[PDB]
Amino acid sequence: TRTVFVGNHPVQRFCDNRIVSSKYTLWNFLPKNLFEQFRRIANFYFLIIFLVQVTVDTPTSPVTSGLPLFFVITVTAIKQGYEDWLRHRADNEVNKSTVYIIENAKRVRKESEKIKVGDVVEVQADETFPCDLILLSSCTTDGTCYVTTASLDGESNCKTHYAVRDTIALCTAESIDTLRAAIECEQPQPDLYKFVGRINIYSNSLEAVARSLGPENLLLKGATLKNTEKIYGVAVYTGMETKMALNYQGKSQKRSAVEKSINAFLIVYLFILLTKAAVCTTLKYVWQSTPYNDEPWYNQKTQKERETLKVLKMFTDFLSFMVLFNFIIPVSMYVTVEMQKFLGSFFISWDKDFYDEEINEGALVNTSDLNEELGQVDYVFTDKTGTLTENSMEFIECCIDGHKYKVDKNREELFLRALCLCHTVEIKTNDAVDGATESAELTYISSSPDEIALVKGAKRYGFTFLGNRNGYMRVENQRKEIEEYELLHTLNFDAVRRRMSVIVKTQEGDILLFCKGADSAVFPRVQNHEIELTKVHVERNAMDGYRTLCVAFKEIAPDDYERINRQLIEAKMALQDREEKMEKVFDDIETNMNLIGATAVEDKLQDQAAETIEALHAAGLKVWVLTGDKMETAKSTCYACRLFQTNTELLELTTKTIEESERKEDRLHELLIEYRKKLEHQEYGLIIDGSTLSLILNSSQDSSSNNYKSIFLQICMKCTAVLCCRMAPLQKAQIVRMVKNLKGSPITLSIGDGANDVSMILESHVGIGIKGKEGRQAARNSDYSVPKFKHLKKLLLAHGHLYYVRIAHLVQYFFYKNLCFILPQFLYQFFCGFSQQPLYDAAYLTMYNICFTSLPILAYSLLEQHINIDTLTSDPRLYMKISGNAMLQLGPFLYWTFLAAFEGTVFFFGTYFLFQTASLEENGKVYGNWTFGTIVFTVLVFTVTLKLALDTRFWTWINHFVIWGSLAFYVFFSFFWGGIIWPFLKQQRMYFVFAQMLSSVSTWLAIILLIFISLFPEILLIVLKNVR
Amino acid sequence: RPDNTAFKQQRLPAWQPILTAGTVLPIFFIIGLIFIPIGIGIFVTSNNIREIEIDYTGTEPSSPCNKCLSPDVTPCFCTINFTLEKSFEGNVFMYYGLSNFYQNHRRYVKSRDDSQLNGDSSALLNPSKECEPYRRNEDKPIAPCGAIMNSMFNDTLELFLIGQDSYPIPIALKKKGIAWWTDKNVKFRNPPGGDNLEERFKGTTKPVNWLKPVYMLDSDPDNNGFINEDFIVWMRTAALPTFRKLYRLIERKSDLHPTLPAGRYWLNVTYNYPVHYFDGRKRMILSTISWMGGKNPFLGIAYIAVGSISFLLGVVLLVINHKY
Ligand SMILES: *[C@@H]1O[C@H](CO)[C@@H](O[C@@H]2O[C@H](CO)[C@@H](O)[C@H](O[C@H]3O[C@H](CO)[C@@H](O)[C@H](O)[C@@H]3O)[C@H]2NC(C)=O)[C@H](O)[C@H]1NC(C)=O
Ligand SMILES: Nc1ncnc2c1ncn2[C@@H]1O[C@H](COP(=O)(O)OP(=O)(O)O)[C@@H](O)[C@H]1O
Ligand SMILES: *[C@@H]1O[C@H](CO)[C@@H](O)[C@H](O)[C@H]1NC(C)=O
Ligand code: ALF
Ligand SMILES: [Mg+2]
Ligand SMILES: [Mg+2]
C-alpha cells in the first residue's frame, strides 16, 4: 500500500524509472553464463574430464577434450550474449527517450529514466507512456484519452481511459498549484488489467473527495496514446514495478518429455562408460599379473613409474580409461539441440496457413520449448463460445412475460428499455455519412458481443440506444424521444456470478436496477411465480442451440438507495480486496428482482470447427469441452461439432438428474463400475456441470470406501467425449489438474479465447490462445496463439508431428554416432596390453563431433519431413497416433544401441581380419596402428553419415550440401592434415596415413564392404516395411 | 502476408525417395550379383598366392635353433631346412613375424622423438622426455632415443638353394625400398649439415641395446642412419601383437626363370633377438603379392557371404510378393 503525493510537495522509498530487461551485464557475463552452462550434466562432465586431463597424465591429449568444449561453450556464450545485447539495446531505446515533466510551473524535459513516483508527466499525442500514469487531466473536457496497447497484450483497439474528475479543471496552467493529493495504491501486481487505489484531493480549506481508482485510470507503461491533444499524469509505478516491466517472468512451463529422455540416455551412457572402464581395469590387472606382461624388456618402465604405490596406479588407470572412453557422451548435443530449437521456432509463425484475413495476423509462438510437445498431446480441453463458435451473435426471439413478444403496453416497454440499458456498449462517438445504412454508422463497439446483439435486437424493434452523453444515456422509445437516463452504478459482470447489472435513475423520478444474467444465476433470486412460465421458453431456446439471458429489474426506494450508495462506494474506496468486498455487496444488492423476460441469441460455429474436432478424434486425442454456457446450448453445439455422434448414449451428471447430495453417487458408481466396465467411441459421452463437479471434488472427504473422485476419473477415461457445462474459470483448471495426474502423464492441451480460459491455458502442458472478438488476454498467457480453432489441426498434426520427429531422431542419433565411435576403441584394448592406447589419432578425436558429424544432423532436424507436410494434415488417422512418445522409448533406444554395438563390432573386427594379411598393397608394405585407426575411422564416418542419408526422405539442396560436404570435408581435412601440419606438432604421427591407406584396392574394397555390412540391418528394415 | 518464400513455408524443392517393392528388391539382387563375382575374383586371386612361413624360434627340443634359444655366445648361427613344392613366380617378399610382441602399447608408442628423427638439430642434442628410460645414458643423449628404436629387430636371416649338387646357391636379397616412400624421403632425415655422418652425430650415443651407432647401420650413405630402411620399418608400429614387417624383397630375374625355384632351401639365422622371455615366436615368411596384397581369404569369403545372403533375401522376397 504505497502513498504517493502528486507534485512531490507535502500535504523517496520508491524505485527509479529504469527498466532492465536483459539478464547479464558487461562485468558479469562470463561469471554468469559459464556458471549456468557448466551446471548441465554433460558440460560439467566434460569440465571434469578436462581437469583430470590437465592434472594427471592420460592417454589422450588435453586439447581433444577442451577444444571441443571451449567451442561448444563459446558458441552458446556468443549466441546468448548477443541475444542479450539486443535486450540492452532495446531497454536503452525505451528508457532514454525524452519526457516532459511539470516540475514547478516549469515544463522540464528530462529522460524517461529520471522520472520518479509522483511527478506530473506531460504526454503529447502518439507518444507512448513513460511509466504507469494516472490520468489526472487532459486538454479536452470530458476527461478521456484513447490508449492502444498495441504492444503490451497485442491488442489493436483504441480503449478509452478516464481522468480524475476533480482534476480535469486543472489544465496546463498552475496544475502545479500544490494540487494536494495522496494516491494510496496497492502494491505492484503484474495483473496488467487490475488496479486498486484511492485519491485524496484536498481543497484550499478542507476536502477529501477521493475518486476510487481502477484499471480505468491507470494508463499502463508503454501503451501508446492515440487521437488526443495531451495528457497530464502522476506517475505511480516507475519502471521494474510497472506491470509492463513486471511481466518479464514468463518461462516456467517449457519442460518437455524429450528433455528428460535426454537425461535418461545420458545416465545410461554414463553407466556404460563406467562399465567399460571398470571391465578394462579389472582385465588390465588380470593381464599384467604375468611378470612379462609388464615391462617385458622391450618397453621397460621408468624408475618413477616403477616405484609408484600400487593402489594409486589402480586409481590412475581407472581415470585413464574414463579419459580414453570419455567421448561416449556427446559434446555437441546441447549446442545443436539449442540452435535447432532457435532456428526452427519460426516455422510455426512464418506459416501462411495461420493467417486470418480479418484480424490481419498469424500465429504467435510465446515459448519455443514446447515445440515438440504439440506432437505428443493426449487430451485437448476447449472452450465452447469463442473458440468452437465465434462471437457473431444474432439476436432472435426475445420473450416478454412468457409471451414470445413479436403484454400490450404494460411491460414490453420496460423489457426493451432493459435491453437498451444494463450494458456497456459505448457506440463509436463519431458516425460516418448517414444515408447508405439503415439508421447510421452507429458502430456499437463493446467488449462483450452478447450486449451488442441485444442492443441490435432492441433496435430491430422501437428502442434505439444512442446515449452515454457524459453521465447520461439516451434511447429512442419507438418514437423519436431521446429520453435521457443517468447511469449511477454499473455492477459489472464476472464469470463466477454470471450477472451484469445497472442502477439507472429515471429522467423524472425513481431508480431502477436492471440485471441481465444467466438463467441459473437469475432464477434463484426472482419472484418465483414467473420462473415456471419463462423457464419453458428458456428451455426450448436452449435445446435449439441458442444462448439465453434472463432480464430482471427492481424498483429501488430512496432510503434503500441511499443505503446501497454507501454499501457500494465503501466497497471501491477500500484498498484491501475491493473486488471481493464488492462482489459480496452487489451480490446482496441483487436479491428479489421482478423477472421481466428472456432473450435468445444464436451463434454459429467457426470455419472448420467440426472437421477439426473430427481430425482430432481421429488422431487419437480426447477432446473435452469445458464451457461456461448452458447445458443444452453446449450440448447442441457439441452435436453440431460432431463431438457427440448420432448413436451415442449420454451419461448426464448434470443438475437435471443429480438433485440430491447422495443420489449423485448412485449414478456416479452405477453407470461406471457396473455399466461402463462390464458392458463405444460413438456410444459413450459424459455431460457434467459445475455445481456437480464441485460436489464430487470438494466435499468428497467423507465417503471413501470407493473414492468419489476416483470412480469419476474412471468414468471419464473410458469416454473420448466429455462436455463440462456451467464451468467457472477456476474449475476449468481444476479439470486440467485432475487429468494431468492420472495413470501417467497424459499430455494435456488447452485452447481458449477469453478471460475465463486464462487459467487452464496456464495450468496445462501446452496452452493455445485464440485471438478473437473478446480480447488478447489469453493469447498472451498462452504458449502458442492462433487466430482460429481450425488452426489447431495444422498446429498439432503437421507441426508437432514434425517438431517431435526431428528432435527424437536427433537425440537417438547423437548417442548412436558416439557409441559407434567408441566401441572400436574399447575393443582395441584387448589387442593391446589393455594399455589404454587410443585407436584414433588426436585430430580425429577432437573433430569427429564438431566438424565431421555436426552439420548433417542439424540440417536434418531443421529441414526434414518424414511424411510430406500435406499428407500429414490430410491423414491424422494414424500419422499422429503413431508416436505417443514411441520414438524415444526403450524399444527404439535399445534398437539404436544394439545397432551401434553391431556396427562398432563390424568396424573393428573387419579391420582386424583384414590386417592378417602381411600386406594390403602390391609393393608389399605393411601398415602400422595409425593406418588401422584411420581405416576404422573412415568406415565409422561413412557409416554414420550414410545411416543418416538412408533416413532422410526429404532431400533439399541443403541436405545434399551438408551430407556430401561433411563426407568431402572428412576426406579433404584428412589429406590436408596428412600433408604439412608439422612445425607446431610433437608427433608427426599421421603424416601420410590417409594417402597411403587409400593406395590399396584392398582397403577400398574392405571399406566398401564394411560400410555395407554395417548398414545392412537397416536396409533390411527398409525392405521389411516396404513389403507387407 | 507471412513471408511466402520457399524456405519459410517448409516447402523447399525436395526429392523424397519413394521406397516401393519394385524399388526395393532389385537392390538386394543387384548387390548380390555385384558382390559374388567380386568375392570370387578376390578369393581366387588370394588362393593363387604362394607363401611359406617357417617358425624358427627354437623351443622344440629337436629344432636346429634350440642351441641359441638360451642366452648363448652372442653370435649364434642356426639353420632350418624348408622345401618349396610349387615354385614362386612373381617378385617375392620376405617378412619376419613376431607374436606376443606388443608394438602397440601406449608406453611403447609414446617412446619416440619425431623432432629428432626428422633431423632437427635442436632435438638431436637433447632428445625429448617421452622416450624416457632410453633418453640419456653415460651422461649423454641417445641418438635414436626411445624404446621403439632401442628394441629393434636385429637378427640376420639368409636363404640358400640346394641345387643338383649340395652346394648352396645364395639367393640375392634386396634392402632398398621397403619403407613408405614418404616416411623415408620426408619424415626421417639425418642431422642437418656435414660431410661425414659421424660428425653430425657428435654429442650423442648409441641406444642401450644396440651394438653399433646409428651412423654405422649401413655403408651406402643413402641407407646409413635415421634413413636406414630397416630402422624406418621397425619404427612404424605393428598395430596388433602378432605382426610382421617387410624384411627383404627378391626381385624377379629378367630371365624366364622363377624367382624361387622349387626344391630345398636353407634358412640360416644369425639368432640375435631374444623372444623366449616374453613367450614370443619368430617366423620368416616368403610370400608373393597380388593386386590385393597377400594371401588373406577374408575379403573373398566375406564378399561371397554377403552377396549370397543378400541374394537369399532377395529370392525370399520375390517369392513372398510375386507369388503372393
Ligand atoms: C640384438 O638385440 C638384442 C636384444 O634386443 C641385444 O641384446 C642386448 O644387448 C645389450 C648389449 O648390446 C645387452 O647388454 C643387453 O643385456 C641387458 O642386460 C645386460 C646385463 O644383464 C646389461 O649390460 C644391458 O644394459 C642390458 O640391459 C641385451 N638385452 C637383451 C639380451 O635382452 C643384442 O645385443 C643385439 N645384438 C646385436 C646388435 O648383434
Ligand atoms: N454481458 C453479459 N451480461 C450478462 N450475462 C452474461 C454476459 N456475457 C455472458 N453472460 C453469462 O455468463 C455466462 C458465461 O459467459 P462466459 O464466462 O464468457 O462463457 P461463455 O461465453 O462461453 O458462455 C454466459 O453463458 C451467460 O449466461
Ligand atoms: C647357412 O646355414 C648353413 C648350415 O650349415 C651354414 O653352413 C652356412 O654357413 C650358413 N650361412 C652362412 C653364415 O654362411
Ligand atoms: F466461451 Al467460454 F468459457 F464458455 F470463453
Ligand atoms: Mg462470454
Ligand atoms: Mg480456446
XYZ file of C-alpha atoms and ligand atoms in Angstrom, chain A residues 297, chain B residues 74 150-152 154 206 208-212 272-274 277, ligand 1:
55
model
C 62.396 -55.878 -21.833
C 76.401 -63.540 -28.856
C 66.191 -49.484 -28.896
C 64.343 -52.801 -29.175
C 64.940 -53.001 -32.909
C 68.403 -57.404 -35.205
C 74.033 -45.317 -29.361
C 71.452 -49.140 -24.800
C 70.744 -52.473 -26.512
C 72.205 -51.697 -29.904
C 75.692 -52.765 -30.919
C 76.893 -50.037 -33.293
C 70.398 -62.346 -32.024
C 66.974 -61.189 -30.953
C 65.604 -62.930 -27.858
C 61.373 -64.390 -22.437
C 70.365 -57.714 -30.714
O 69.296 -57.341 -29.854
C 69.410 -57.900 -28.561
C 68.124 -57.717 -27.772
O 67.458 -56.512 -28.158
C 70.602 -57.261 -27.896
O 70.678 -57.746 -26.555
C 71.002 -56.685 -25.636
O 72.297 -56.143 -25.923
C 72.936 -55.398 -24.908
C 74.354 -55.049 -25.327
O 74.375 -54.721 -26.718
C 72.963 -56.338 -23.743
O 73.991 -55.963 -22.828
C 71.557 -56.352 -23.192
O 71.568 -57.006 -21.929
C 70.883 -56.279 -20.889
O 71.342 -56.697 -19.609
C 72.756 -56.545 -19.509
C 73.263 -57.232 -18.244
O 72.489 -58.403 -17.954
C 73.105 -55.062 -19.482
O 74.522 -54.939 -19.631
C 72.433 -54.264 -20.600
O 72.382 -52.878 -20.241
C 71.034 -54.758 -20.978
O 70.070 -54.143 -20.113
C 70.823 -57.206 -24.209
N 69.416 -57.335 -23.890
C 68.767 -58.486 -24.029
C 69.616 -59.701 -24.232
O 67.557 -58.564 -23.984
C 71.815 -57.699 -28.692
O 72.993 -57.087 -28.171
C 71.698 -57.284 -30.136
N 72.780 -57.929 -30.843
C 73.453 -57.401 -31.859
C 73.232 -55.951 -32.161
O 74.219 -58.075 -32.515
